[model samples]
Target chain A: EFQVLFVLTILTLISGTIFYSTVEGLRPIDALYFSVVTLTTVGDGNFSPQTDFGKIFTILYIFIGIGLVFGFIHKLAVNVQLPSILSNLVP
Target chain B: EFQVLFVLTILTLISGTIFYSTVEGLRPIDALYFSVVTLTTVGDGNFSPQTDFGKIFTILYIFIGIGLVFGFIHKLAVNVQLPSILSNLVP
Candidate 1:
């Protein structure tokens, strides 16, 4: 489950980058950078898409990234909780 | 300590990417992509800066990348071990 989530998160980021690059006339590198920066919410303000479409894409990317990060945190919590739960049940 | 390490790692990545873009005149996209690729050790070979300054920046970025990743892993390990330690202390 954890591995699956990790792969999905990566795929989502990669595809979003490719899509934005194609639409915004930015290089793949630029698209990727924008995607990561936005998703990570690092927003250095060094480069941004000037179009409405690009901004919308960024909004969507943030939504997805937040979801992924939350999911990762939840998974980590669950994994940590399991041993304690198991011990309690055994004893 | 773990939180501090995380913040420093992020700062290093952001600053390195920003500096490379400023010096190489690459778009933010290329600079960010190069930094992440090198830092993650992903090395997709898609976009790289062509200046001596940029290359030197990349080398330093890689060294920092190694340190950050190692630190994160160590922190994670410590976090994981804490529960076990607590359990041993209790019982």
Candidate 2:
């Protein structure tokens, strides 16, 4: 289940990086770096949308990507961390 | 539970940014930006550890912080996304 989410995120991110690199003329590593940063909503401001397409793509990407990551974080907090903390308390 | 993890992450990140900003002389915004990126492992490389202390702290921060984020992500996938997808399929 975890792999499924991670795989989806990685695949989507790779596609995003490829598009950004080719369209925005950023280096491959830079584009890859940008995708990872953008999806996390970290937005370090090191790199960003440079063109109309890039800007629009980033907007779309933010809604979908951020939702997924947020839900991902929310779920993790409830299940694994909560259970572990509880068990430790009893033990 | 989600709030707990998020609070911990935020607190730790705040500490990290405050420490880095003062020690490394980064602007507050930039230090905050760096902490977010580093914890997420998105690492845009726009800002990074420059001094020996910064570098060492980054290493410690990465292992502890990234582990928490990964576990957070993993649990979310299992508890939230997985069930949501499963429910939609059955309905």
Candidate 3:
């Protein structure tokens, strides 16, 4: 579950980064950086896709990417320590 | 549970934002924006802690703040739709 999708999610990122590099003429590092930042949905206004393919890819990328992360986080967040952790947190 | 600690988490962000805005002289909006971005670990670098107190608070904020979100997302992500989601995702 967490193990495999995490791999798929990483693959998604790596491929998306590669797509960005080729389409946007970005360096590999920048492509990787933007792919990750997009996943977080921070959209820092640092860079944006310019071409038609780039824009389309970004749109689809965000949906798929964030959705993957959401699933990842959701699985990771759900039943771990919500009850006892914070109860003991302040005390 | 998720509900109560969620409330506590929101308080942590709200109060942290208030602290940052006052101490760092950030607009309230920017303070909030920074808090959220930090929580996601996106850290766009649009703003940062300038004062020593601000830096210290940020350290604590990241530890405590991200801890909560990770917990929240972890519980949410764990068992909802993992194997089947991606298995059916592309197929």
Ranking by TM-score: 2, 3, 1
- Report per-candidate TM-score of chain A alone: 0.67, 0.75, 0.76
TM-score of chain B of each: 0.67, 0.74, 0.75
Task: Please give the distance, in angstroms, between residue B39's alpha carbon in candidate 3 and its true position after superposition.
Answer: 3.2
Write down the C-alpha DockQ for each prediction: 0.05, 0.13, 0.10
Clashing pairs in 1: A30-B29
Comparing 1 with 2 on TM-score, the higher-scoring candidate is 2
Which digits, one per residue and each the tens of the lDDT, describe model 2 over residues B2-91? 555566677778888897899889998888887777777677456745565765566456534654666556667877789889988994
> CAPRI verdict on model 3?
incorrect
Candidate 3 residues A1-91, lDDT tens each?
8677668777987897799899899877667666765675545345778899999988888887787865655544444434455456676
* lDDT at A55, model 1: 81
Q: What is the lDDT of residue A33 in candidate 3?
A: 60
What lDDT tens digits, residue by residue, belong to model 2 across residues A22-89?
Answer: 99997666676667556665554456677999999888988888766555445554555556766765
Every candidate's lDDT: 0.62, 0.69, 0.69
Give me the candidate number with maximum lDDT.
3
Report the C-alpha displacement of residue A52, candidate 2, in angstroms: 1.9
